[PDB]
Amino acid sequence: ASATRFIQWLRNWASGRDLQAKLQLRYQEISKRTQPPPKLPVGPSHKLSNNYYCTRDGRREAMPPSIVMSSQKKAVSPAPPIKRWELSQDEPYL
């Protein structure tokens, strides 16, 4: 930011861009290194009632694998064929 007006022109012209708008060194735009204290929220299970753990226990709803066949019709694919990707409307060609 301290560069003279001539040097700013010189490096702007050499690079072809306006480097001063997007300096790669940081000045005052950064956040202050001291911040106000946070007050973080709590999750959905912070209830005093209607909150029995057996109604929200993900681990206990896991099950052993379903056995489709054990040694002890139309053809199917493992899933429907993948849909074709559409070309970008933002910038199709680089």
Binding site: S15, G16, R17, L19, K22, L23, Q24, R26, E29, I30, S31, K32, Q35, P36, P38, L40, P41, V42, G43, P44, S45, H46, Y53, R56, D57, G58, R59, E61, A62, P64, P65, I82, W85, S88, D90, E91, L94
Partner: protein
């Protein structure tokens, strides 16, 4: 004859040491035999003596340029066996830092790729940007690299106040930095002479050799796990997948540079769409309670004590979970026996298959084209060797 490429460049480089046994005839490479294992540290056996939390830091040290992406893969695998769901703010944070990590990796991949070829100036310009992104890692986790921030259940801590504005400030100017990198390489006839038509791989050969990531997309294969098999909140962000047309080093180089631009595009959406709420699953049998709860509530203290000693138990089962890591498909085959320590943990490193293809990709090339070909695959022997 027979040569052996040096362990590493004379300049400082961070991707591991390789013993490459080469067969040549004149200037031409007749055979490449990569001798790896020089960084094999028995990570997978060590993980079997750790609880599921204790094993998480082992994943920062695999592809130790894409730290949080490796964490996310392991966290998704454990969350899947636990049958729980991380909270939405955690998912947005994980995608936000997933793309920041993708920038970190692609800077390392592209500028060290140029540095090894001898174009060394862009390395210095772009690791000043990596230094600022290390500051983002250290501000959420206290560590510049091995954060151990993403965990099964969400993230360890919430973003410090003021972090998002600083990430916005960095992202504001980053595209110009990519533009300066392209000014040095993209149209440079010397760079193109070193990369164009080097290490061509056909689409079918790429699939059968087990490639993934840019190694597939450089050959025109329209595959990106963030699009086809989305995880976390990747289905709520807009981005384009770069696709190559010639399957060579130059097309893969352009894909990585364009992926960096799309990462900035995704980061812009994460900053604007970050929702409020908690950061880890509100389930004190998986995620430890807040320190204020641990010091006031009997249930909270018990769960804190047990989570930090025995750890949480994972229902028995096995999953293969993979993500679109910056280096390709990074997966884990995680086997649970019902206890609080994993029974088996195989790590699928994208660079393992890629380095296995070096012999194929280098046929009929010069000794210096092997340098470019290991460069375009972006190999980190931390993940190749485990």
């Amino acid at each position: 004859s027979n040569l052996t490429l040096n362990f590493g460049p004379q300049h400082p480089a961070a991707h591991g040491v390789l013993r490459l046994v080469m067969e040549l005839s004149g200037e031409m490479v007749r055979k490449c035999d990569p001798h790896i294992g020089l960084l094999h540290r028995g990570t997978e056996k060590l993980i079997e003596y750790k609880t599921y939390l204790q094993a998480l830091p082992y994943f920062d040290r695999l592809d130790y340029v894409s730290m949080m992406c490796n964490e996310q893969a392991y966290s998704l695998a454990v969350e899947k066996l636990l049958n729980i769901r991380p909270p939405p703010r955690a998912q947005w944070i994980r995608v936000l830092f997933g793309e920041i990590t993708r920038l970190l990796n692609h800077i390392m991949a592209v500028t060290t790729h140029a540095l090894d070829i001898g174009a060394m100036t862009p390395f210095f310009w772009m690791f000043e940007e990596r230094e600022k992104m290390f500051e983002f890692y250290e501000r959420v986790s206290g560590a510049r690299m091995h954060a151990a921030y993403v965990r099964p259940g969400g993230v360890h801590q919430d973003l410090p106040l003021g972090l998002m504005d600083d990430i916005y400030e960095f992202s504001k100017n980053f595209s110009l930095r990519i533009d300066e990198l392209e000014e040095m390489l993209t149209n440079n006839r010397i760079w193109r002479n070193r990369t164009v038509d080097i290490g061509i791989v056909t689409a079918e050969d790429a699939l059968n050799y087990g490639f993934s990531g840019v190694m597939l997309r450089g050959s025109g294969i329209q595959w990106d796990l963030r699009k086809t098999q989305p995880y976390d909140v990747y289905d709520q962000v807009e981005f384009d997948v770069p696709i190559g047309s010639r399957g060579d080093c130059y097309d893969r180089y352009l894909c990585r540079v364009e992926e960096m631009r799309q990462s900035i595009r995704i980061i812009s959406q994460c900053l604007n769409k970050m929702p409020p709420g908690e950061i880890k699953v509100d389930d004190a049998k998986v995620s430890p309670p807040k320190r204020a709860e641990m010091k006031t509530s009997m249930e909270s203290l018990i769960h804190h004590f047990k989570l930090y000693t025995e750890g949480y138990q994972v229902p028995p089962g096995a999953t293969y979970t993979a993500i679109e890591a910056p280096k390709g498909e990074f997966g884990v085959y995680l086997v649970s026996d019902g206890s609080s320590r994993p029974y088996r943990c195989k790590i699928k490193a994208p660079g393992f298959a890629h380095l296995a293809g070096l012999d194929k990709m280098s046929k009929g090339h010069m000794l210096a084209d092997v340098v470019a070909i290991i460069g375009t695959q972006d190999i980190v022997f931390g993940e190749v060797d485990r």
